With several copies, the nearest count.
Chain A
């Protein structure tokens, strides 16, 4: 943090574990965010914010390990905190929390160094335009819109193969745009990680994006700290005037880490033992994301879902915090469909109305009705024979199973398994195909073509194939 010569000593005052009581010169001390390092045997050690205490002594902490203490102790005080050397070279390259090129080191040269502590508000700064993010997602995006730089909530889970979703995003970023983003896991089963690295090789696209990962092998001070990192890092690219979105890890892991800190803080926890200020942290987090005037920062997150307590202050947060909703359904996929996502149960206030545009909200708004009907219908059938059913019911059943089927779609990235080249979706195209479809336009065609198919023109070609 310092432009560093000297930086002095202090002594080590009172130490229980991470609790760092130590004392600097009587004259002055750097900020709590500001920080200092001391070579302890093998290595230097830097402890986190001291908070305010006396005699040049004040209270501090570190993610690293505390063994081998010494009463008298001397730390060279770093000054301008947190300066960190990111560079665009990072993409596809991995470092530790320290930027330590954690993996087989890519050796990762970096010309940028900046504190992650950087605020990122500015009044009136970002553009007033309110652009939507265009995903080319046959249902995710079509079924629901996406806003540029927008926050996105995640429902789905194990067995979702969310990475499939991610890879879809990979082809989606490059394919869609030059803009490229990276996310990082923290507090997580390692195997998943390495497998995902291999999966990056298989993906092969890993270059565009890279991250240190927390893996939950680690001490919290690190953990809770990690956020500011990514903040600064993307802050390269949105700072690059580039624009992007990164995935995010279990928050409850994060905020909860907040409490463990607060007990650590010795401070009175919030209620239900939250971090007494934990909201404030959320201020940091949610407050962080923005689509700048010159950049866009979107993201999605999956937080540890705690018993599905809606009473959850954390759920309060999410619900409060969330700008968008993911849903994925093992029953839904369990229809067999590639698309596990809950087709019902998707809402983005963003995607909603007219003024979100009408006709889209028309084929859309009724598409809801179709949903309802397939509910009632798919529902009611097993009860008894369908003979009584009005034709309209029947026809609905076809347009139903086949509309469903019609959703399923190929993916480029999917190729590695199957060679499926997939395609980038098109809104005019989509609204077209669906709208006509809704009318039962071209009612004659075979249902089987529609599942995992191409465009109404292309599936129309499959009618030729048919």
Chain B
């Protein structure tokens, strides 16, 4: 099996997509009909990630400075 590489240094880009990044993979197996699982943690830096970004994006923050994208994200 393969695990992602995720570092503290990791550019927030990689960070924010990084699970969504992760998604495309197993679509191999499941889409291959092969079966798979994956770990999920609370990465949760993601919000200041995609979000602090959004500040850069000038974007309007949601609660806890974070928009409902979590839902969307989730």
The reply to whether the CB of B33 lies closer than 8 angstroms to some CB of chain A is no
In the bound complex, what is the Cα–Cα distance between A260 and B62 (angstroms)? 9
Q: Interface 1/0s, chain A 269-299, versus B by CB < 8 A?
A: 0110100110110010011000000000000
Q: Interface 1/0s, chain B 23-62, versus A by CB < 8 A?
A: 0000000000000000000000000100010010010101
* Cβ-defined partner of B9 (8 Å) among A271, A273, A287: A287
User: SS class of chain A's interface: helix, strand, loop or mixed?
Assistant: helix
Within 8 A of B (CB), among A225-279: 256, 259-260, 263, 266-268, 270-271, 273, 276-277, 279
Q: In the complex, how many angstroms separate the beta carbon of B11 from the nearest chain A beta carbon?
A: 9
In the bound complex, what is the Cα–Cα distance between A280 and B62 (angstroms)? 21
Determine if B52 and A276 form an interchain contact, defined as CB atoms under 8 angstroms apart.
yes
Q: In the complex, how many angstroms separate the beta carbon of B1 from the nearest chain A beta carbon?
A: 21
* Cβ-defined partner of B60 (8 Å) among A266, A279, A283, A287: A266
A263 partner residues in chain B, CB cutoff 8 A: 60, 62, 67-68
A287 partner residues in chain B, CB cutoff 8 A: 8-9
Determine if B52 and A277 form an interchain contact, defined as CB atoms under 8 angstroms apart.
yes
Task: Knowing A283-B9, A287-B9 are in contact, say whether A270-B65 is a contact too (CB < 8 A).
Answer: yes
B60 partner residues in chain A, CB cutoff 8 A: 263, 266
The reply to whether the CB of A121 lies closer than 8 angstroms to some CB of chain B is yes
Determine if A271 and B8 form an interchain contact, defined as CB atoms under 8 angstroms apart.
no
A256 partner residues in chain B, CB cutoff 8 A: 68
> Which residue in chain B gives the minimum CB-CB distance to A253?
B71
Sample (7) of A-B pairs whose CB atoms are under 8 Å apart:
A121-B7, A121-B9, A263-B68, A267-B55, A268-B58, A276-B55, A283-B8
- Additional 19 contacts, C-beta under 8 A, given A260-B68, A263-B67: A121-B9, A219-B72, A256-B68, A260-B67, A263-B60, A263-B62, A266-B60, A267-B55, A268-B55, A268-B58, A270-B48, A273-B63, A276-B52, A277-B52, A279-B52, A283-B8, A283-B9, A286-B8, A287-B9
